[PDB]
Amino acid sequence: REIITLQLGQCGNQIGFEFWKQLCAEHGISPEGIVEEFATDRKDVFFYQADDEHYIPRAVLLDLEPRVIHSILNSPYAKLYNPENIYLGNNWASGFSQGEKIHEDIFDIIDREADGSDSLEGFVLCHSIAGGTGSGLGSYLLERLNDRYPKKLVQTYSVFPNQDEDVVVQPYNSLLTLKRLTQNADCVVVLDNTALNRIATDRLHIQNPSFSQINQLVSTIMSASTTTLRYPGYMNNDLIGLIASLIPTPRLHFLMTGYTPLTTDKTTVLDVMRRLLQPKNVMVSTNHCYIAILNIIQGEVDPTQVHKSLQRIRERKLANFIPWGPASIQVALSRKSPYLPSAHRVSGLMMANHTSISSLFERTCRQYDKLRKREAFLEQFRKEDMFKDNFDEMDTSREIVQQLIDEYHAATRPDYISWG
Amino acid sequence: REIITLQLGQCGNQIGFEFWKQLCAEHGISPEGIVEEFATDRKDVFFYQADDEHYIPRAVLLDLEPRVIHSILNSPYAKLYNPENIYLGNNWASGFSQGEKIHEDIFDIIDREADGSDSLEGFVLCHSIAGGTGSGLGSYLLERLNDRYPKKLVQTYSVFPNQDEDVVVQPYNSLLTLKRLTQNADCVVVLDNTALNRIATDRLHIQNPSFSQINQLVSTIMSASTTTLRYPGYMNNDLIGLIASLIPTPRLHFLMTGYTPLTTDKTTVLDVMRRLLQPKNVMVSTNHCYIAILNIIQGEVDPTQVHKSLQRIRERKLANFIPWGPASIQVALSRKSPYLPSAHRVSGLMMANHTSISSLFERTCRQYDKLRKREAFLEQFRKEDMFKDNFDEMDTSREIVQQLIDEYHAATRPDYISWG
Amino acid sequence: NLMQTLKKDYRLVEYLQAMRNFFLDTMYDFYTSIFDQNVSFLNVQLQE
Amino acid sequence: VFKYLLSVRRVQAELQHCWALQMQRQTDAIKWRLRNHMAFLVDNLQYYLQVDVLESQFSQLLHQINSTRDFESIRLAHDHFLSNLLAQSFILLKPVFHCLNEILDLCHSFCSLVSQNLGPLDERGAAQLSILVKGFSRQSSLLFKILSHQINSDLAQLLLRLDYNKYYTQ
């Protein structure tokens, strides 16, 4: 149904702006809100309908000590929505404590559009992990929406901060926010900043203007995530229909990404299928095996070579799945998006559960253990002392995520019929 | 037909001035009385026609110990009418005794315009309950017009004084005036000062300049009450055509108010209909059920989506009506008013009978019982002793309004086929 | 000629395309209400 | 059409006259007030229905007149105008007509009967009062059953009454 999108933090507001601008590009609408008279499809997936051929997008923007939000503000893409929801330290405790006091008025802004929304499906978080002001604030707000809404779904687009190195409180922030992510979020879409940096250095030879091209790749993935909903498909035209196959249990709810070109400056569906299997074409970087995969194709339709390709990816034997279960990689076909010029008319997308990210989690866990034992990297401010005098909540968070690592490794085994 | 409007008391003269000024704004007329030569509609609904493109409004103003009437007097809106009808304690007995002696000359001023009026439909009272000088005086004059005119209709716009608290004779004044209101008035329009204070604190954050913004909301409701008459409609172009459906019996004659924006600093008729059903959008604050509702819409006309919306508010099932009767919420459509700039081009209005106000009446009754037993709050002046040595008329008034509460609660039941 | 004036104006194929669009987004909302009945209750849901 | 429209229009005003008598003023009075209001509803609804068909059909008439340069379509527009008007008044269909006539007749007698005494009639007024309330309930439910075509305004109005189920239990 309808989903209110929720952006906070500097990077998270950048992707919120970039996604909504890209959806303005995708639909036959002006950047001022006017729908075009030379336009079939739906332009009401996330948009409040005003009159002047105005579909006002249903997005709430949030800021804390704003720098980039002013540059977002002066834009012709600020006249599409902005129902006047602008409202004003780089630690987790900074964002957490500053969100603590002002939670009621921003939640009143939420309730405004909540009664404004006749239909609802979910809330999408545009988050950034270890973004400073976004950290703490986003986890606090996540706790509040979960506490207020046990009837709604939450999906979070969040970065995994790893750029091969300075901020020394980063594993602490990621540890606490991941604790809130595991137990207060229904859906997690994770990506590697290192892997996107790798693919950016693949397609070009840039090192300084990485951010804008990272915005290109993330907008492609975010548009591909919503193409089945924005354009009339047949299944996973809801969030929950897409989500339900992917999560076999809500400790395994972290989802992987894919985009089939490497460089975006006849190939059959088999080829993009078989290379969307490859980890050089996956945008997120013993044996790890997939727990469930779903793939999504938008482009040229060969009406029988789908099942022919299906038999082919079977007998190829590139990916063996979970032992203790009937786990399939599953096919979805959608319309390629009109109203915009497009290179690579065939484009693919994977959502999967894989056990490989437990390595990244134990990486952060080991770094946290090192900095916590070495004891110079909590950076001892008044925020952290008022939040916790004895600093045991971080220890509890490490305990819970270690338990989650144990659950991951036990799910990695062929036997996960017993608990743990 | 034609209606002579009757204002007394400080607050009542304020709304009389505000309404007549707003009707000057609504029609294509100058504040000096001159009709504009750049102007279809009727400008004779309440106006005596002089020559100089002068429609002189037919309003009689009354004052007692005048303070605010002098500020009303020095105005460019005092040159529209004023056929020289100005004529000079905060208790009910004060206004009652002072009206007692001078009733004949003000009634002669009434008879002046009565023979002046070729056509007549009713008399509208601009009253304020527990306004001091307005109380007693207004009920006395109400008794006199009823005694003189059994052929005419009377509607009273009156405040319900409740601002969550000093005047201690207020429930006594409200009790006596409500006794006169039940048995000497044909039509009652009540509003809550508390609810208008709530909506004023909703739309802004004011606490001190509440009066002027209260004037804004009341002028909107008063103009919406008369739009079907001032602009050519088809039904309820008379007072009595509007009134007759609303009163099923003249113990149930107290009418409720509505205005669809909360903040007045495409949406279909269904939406304003369904939220004019909501009590957060009603400007007056077991289960209570409506006895009859009539709704009035002025704005954008969708010619078939009226009945589509009608089927919709049926199957929505938000409001179940009186059991022992065929009670419908009923639709009226009118022209949106020309000759003035207007925000919220769609605007709605509800007139209804609801049983919820019997709570407010028993609130005043219980407060009166408390102060009457506690015996320090009649404030023992010569007015009250000359009016009644033994003070049994207030006891009789409480008895009658208690009987009215019993009638209200018996009408609340599914069985009101038997009397009482 | 007869085929030409039966595929435009009393055109069959549009009715048929609509038929296979009455099964097969919009119908998600439609189905979910039926899942948790009356023959007019379906009617008001379809007519919106 | 003029004859019928004035019949129902005649009923509406004298019902307001009964209202004016009762509001200025026992068991016997309040039953008259209830019967008065209950009659007023359905009598208002009848006229307003004929108004809906007038407003909607007149636009199509004027539009077809203003969009052609030929006589035959104009005469045809008058024919269609008449056919739908006479259909929607239900003067072509006899039971529904033979019931609304009785609604008007009982309201005529009721208006006269309440106007006779300005105190409550317990002198043979109860005898006619029981006869009138039973006949009025009977006829209102019968005609409502007959109406409860295939158009849009006509349906949506019926369903107003069964938001209460008061012309299904009467």
From Swiss-Prot, chains A, B:
CDD domains: gamma_tubulin. Signal peptide: none annotated. Pfam families: Tubulin (PF00091), Tubulin_C (PF03953). Phosphorylation at Ser-119 by BRSK1 regulates centrosome duplication, possibly by mediating relocation of gamma-tubulin and its associated proteins from the cytoplasm to the centrosome. One of its GO terms (biological process) is mitotic sister chromatid segregation. SMART domains: Tubulin (SM00864), Tubulin_C (SM00865). Keywords: Cytoplasm, Cytoskeleton, Disease variant, GTP-binding, Lissencephaly, Microtubule, Nucleotide-binding, Phosphoprotein. The modification Phosphoserine is found at residue 119. Component of the gamma-tubulin ring complex (gTuRC) consisting of TUBGCP2, TUBGCP3, TUBGCP4, TUBGCP5 and TUBGCP6 and gamma-tubulin TUBG1 or TUBG2. TUBGCP2, TUBGCP3, TUBGCP4, TUBGCP5 and TUBGCP6 assemble in a 5:5:2:1:1 stoichiometry; each is associated with a gamma-tubulin, thereby arranging 14 gamma-tubulins in a helical manner. Gamma-tubulin at the first position is blocked by TUBGCP3 at the last position, allowing 13 protafilaments to grow into a microtubule. Belongs to the tubulin family. This is Tubulin gamma-1 chain. The lineage of its organism: Eukaryota, Metazoa, Chordata, Craniata, Vertebrata.
UniProtKB/Swiss-Prot annotation, chain C:
It is found in: Cytoplasm, Cytoskeleton, Microtubule organizing center, Centrosome. Component of the gamma-tubulin ring complex (gTuRC) which mediates microtubule nucleation. The gTuRC regulates the minus-end nucleation of alpha-beta tubulin heterodimers that grow into microtubule protafilaments, a critical step in centrosome duplication and spindle formation. Belongs to the TUBGCP family. Widely expressed, with highest levels in heart and skeletal muscle and moderate levels in brain. The chain holds residues 705 to 764 of 1024 of the full protein. Signal peptide: none annotated. Component of the gamma-tubulin ring complex (gTuRC) consisting of TUBGCP2, TUBGCP3, TUBGCP4, TUBGCP5 and TUBGCP6 and gamma-tubulin TUBG1 or TUBG2. TUBGCP2, TUBGCP3, TUBGCP4, TUBGCP5 and TUBGCP6 assemble in a 5:5:2:1:1 stoichiometry; each is associated with a gamma-tubulin, thereby arranging 14 gamma-tubulins in a helical manner. Gamma-tubulin at the first position is blocked by TUBGCP3 at the last position, allowing 13 protafilaments to grow into a microtubule. This is Gamma-tubulin complex component 5.
From Swiss-Prot, chain D:
It comes from Homo sapiens (Human). The lineage of its organism: Eukaryota, Metazoa, Chordata, Craniata, Vertebrata. Component of the gamma-tubulin ring complex (gTuRC) consisting of TUBGCP2, TUBGCP3, TUBGCP4, TUBGCP5 and TUBGCP6 and gamma-tubulin TUBG1 or TUBG2. TUBGCP2, TUBGCP3, TUBGCP4, TUBGCP5 and TUBGCP6 assemble in a 5:5:2:1:1 stoichiometry; each is associated with a gamma-tubulin, thereby arranging 14 gamma-tubulins in a helical manner. Gamma-tubulin at the first position is blocked by TUBGCP3 at the last position, allowing 13 protafilaments to grow into a microtubule. Transmembrane segments: none annotated. Component of the gamma-tubulin ring complex (gTuRC) which mediates microtubule nucleation. The gTuRC regulates the minus-end nucleation of alpha-beta tubulin heterodimers that grow into microtubule protafilaments, a critical step in centrosome duplication and spindle formation. Ubiquitously expressed. Belongs to the TUBGCP family. It is found in: Cytoplasm, Cytoskeleton, Microtubule organizing center, Centrosome. This is Gamma-tubulin complex component 4. It comes from the Eukaryota. It is linked to Microcephaly and chorioretinopathy, autosomal recessive, 3: A disorder characterized by congenital microcephaly and chorioretinal dysplasia associated with poor vision and nystagmus. Variable ocular anomalies include microphthalmia, retinal folding, retinal detachment, optic nerve hypoplasia, absence of retinal vessels, round areas of chorioretinal atrophy, and attenuated electroretinogram. Most patients have mild developmental delay and mild learning difficulties.
